[PDB]
Enzyme design. Structure first.
Site, mmCIF file in Angstrom:
data_model
loop_
_atom_site.group_PDB
_atom_site.id
_atom_site.type_symbol
_atom_site.label_atom_id
_atom_site.label_comp_id
_atom_site.label_asym_id
_atom_site.label_seq_id
_atom_site.Cartn_x
_atom_site.Cartn_y
_atom_site.Cartn_z
ATOM 1 N N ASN A 1 -43.493 18.650 -60.915
ATOM 2 C CA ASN A 1 -43.976 17.886 -62.005
ATOM 3 C C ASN A 1 -44.142 18.811 -63.215
ATOM 4 O OD1 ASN A 1 -46.388 15.153 -63.061
ATOM 5 N ND2 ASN A 1 -44.112 15.577 -63.563
ATOM 6 N N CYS B 1 -41.366 21.028 -64.681
ATOM 7 C CA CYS B 1 -40.135 21.606 -65.348
ATOM 8 C C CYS B 1 -39.195 20.188 -65.466
ATOM 9 C CB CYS B 1 -39.368 22.652 -64.507
ATOM 10 S SG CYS B 1 -40.101 24.100 -64.093
ATOM 11 N N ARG B 2 -38.626 19.969 -64.718
ATOM 12 C CA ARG B 2 -37.383 18.889 -64.613
ATOM 13 C C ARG B 2 -37.976 17.337 -64.855
ATOM 14 N NH1 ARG B 2 -34.659 20.353 -58.980
ATOM 15 N NH2 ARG B 2 -37.046 20.544 -58.626
ATOM 16 N N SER B 3 -38.747 16.997 -63.960
ATOM 17 C CA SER B 3 -39.122 15.401 -64.032
ATOM 18 C C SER B 3 -40.084 15.245 -65.451
ATOM 19 C CB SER B 3 -39.910 14.849 -62.811
ATOM 20 O OG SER B 3 -41.182 15.567 -62.500
ATOM 21 N N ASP C 1 -33.276 23.379 -59.890
ATOM 22 C CA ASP C 1 -34.792 23.952 -60.543
ATOM 23 C C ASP C 1 -34.536 25.190 -61.236
ATOM 24 O OD1 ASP C 1 -37.538 24.489 -60.622
ATOM 25 O OD2 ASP C 1 -37.913 24.974 -58.749
ATOM 26 N N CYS D 1 -39.928 15.346 -59.192
ATOM 27 C CA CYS D 1 -39.487 16.687 -58.898
ATOM 28 C C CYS D 1 -40.605 17.242 -57.891
ATOM 29 C CB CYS D 1 -39.091 17.618 -59.806
ATOM 30 S SG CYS D 1 -40.640 17.889 -61.125
HETATM 31 O O1 LIG Z 1 -41.559 20.844 -61.426
HETATM 32 P P1 LIG Z 1 -40.221 21.300 -60.757
HETATM 33 O O2 LIG Z 1 -38.671 21.114 -61.576
HETATM 34 O O3 LIG Z 1 -39.746 20.533 -59.374
HETATM 35 C C1 LIG Z 1 -40.212 22.968 -60.462
HETATM 36 C C2 LIG Z 1 -41.600 23.633 -59.641
HETATM 37 C C3 LIG Z 1 -42.747 23.916 -60.474
HETATM 38 C C4 LIG Z 1 -43.821 24.451 -59.909
HETATM 39 C C5 LIG Z 1 -44.092 24.332 -58.441
HETATM 40 C C6 LIG Z 1 -43.008 23.556 -57.699
HETATM 41 C C7 LIG Z 1 -41.893 23.512 -58.150
#
Ligand SMILES: O=P(O)(O)Cc1ccccc1
Length: 157
Positions: A15, A17-19, A129, A12
């Site tokens: 790195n 939230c999602r991944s 996101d 993502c």
């Molecule tokens: O880790 P993810 O899901 O892409 C969301 C995110 C978190 C912080 C900065 C940019 C994007």
């Protein structure tokens, strides 16, 4: 032992939230099935924004709720990641474009680069996101990661 390696990198933008969620969903899956030894599992960020950072504490709470403990230190994707990884499975459309740019700046790309959400039986392409969402949004992301990761384990594109 004549008694009885594959690699996947979840990606993502940050790195955090999602991944990381996907990664620990997949690791549990291979760990429950005794096949963790056969798998190399990791996650990474297209950007430097979060390097060194633990996962989002909101997403960490979602995972604790579901039994799955997350221990990951945010890092940014490297050139090697493309050479060493079989699959690079990302969340959203903007991830995929950014990964494709990156993929033309290395000699060897062994990796199939694709949407994690293209393994969904429920056909929900994008894992969106949850940075500005709430715990429902984190729970939705987790559920998507389970479906997609289970199918992807079942058999890969
Ligand atoms: O880790 P993810 O899901 O892409 C969301 C995110 C978190 C912080 C900065 C940019 C994007």
């Amino acid at each position: 032992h004549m008694e009885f390696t594959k690699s996947v990198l979840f990606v993502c933008l940050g790195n955090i939230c999602r991944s990381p969620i996907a990664e620990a969903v997949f690791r549990k899956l291979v760990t429950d099935q005794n096949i963790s030894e056969n798998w190399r599992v990791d996650s990474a960020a297209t950007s430097g924004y979060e390097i060194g950072n633990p996962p989002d504490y909101r997403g960490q709470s979602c995972m604790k709720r579901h039994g799955i403990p997350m221990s990951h230190v945010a890092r940014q994707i490297t050139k090697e990641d493309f050479a060493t990884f079989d699959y690079i499975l990302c969340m959203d459309e903007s991830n995929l474009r950014d990964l494709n740019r990156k993929s033309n700046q290395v000699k060897t790309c062994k990796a199939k680069i694709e949407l994690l959400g293209s393994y969904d039986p429920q056909k929900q392409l994008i894992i969106e996101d949850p940075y500005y969402g709430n715990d429902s949004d984190f729970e939705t992301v987790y559920q998507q990661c389970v479906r997609c990761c289970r199918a992807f384990l079942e058999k890969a594109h």
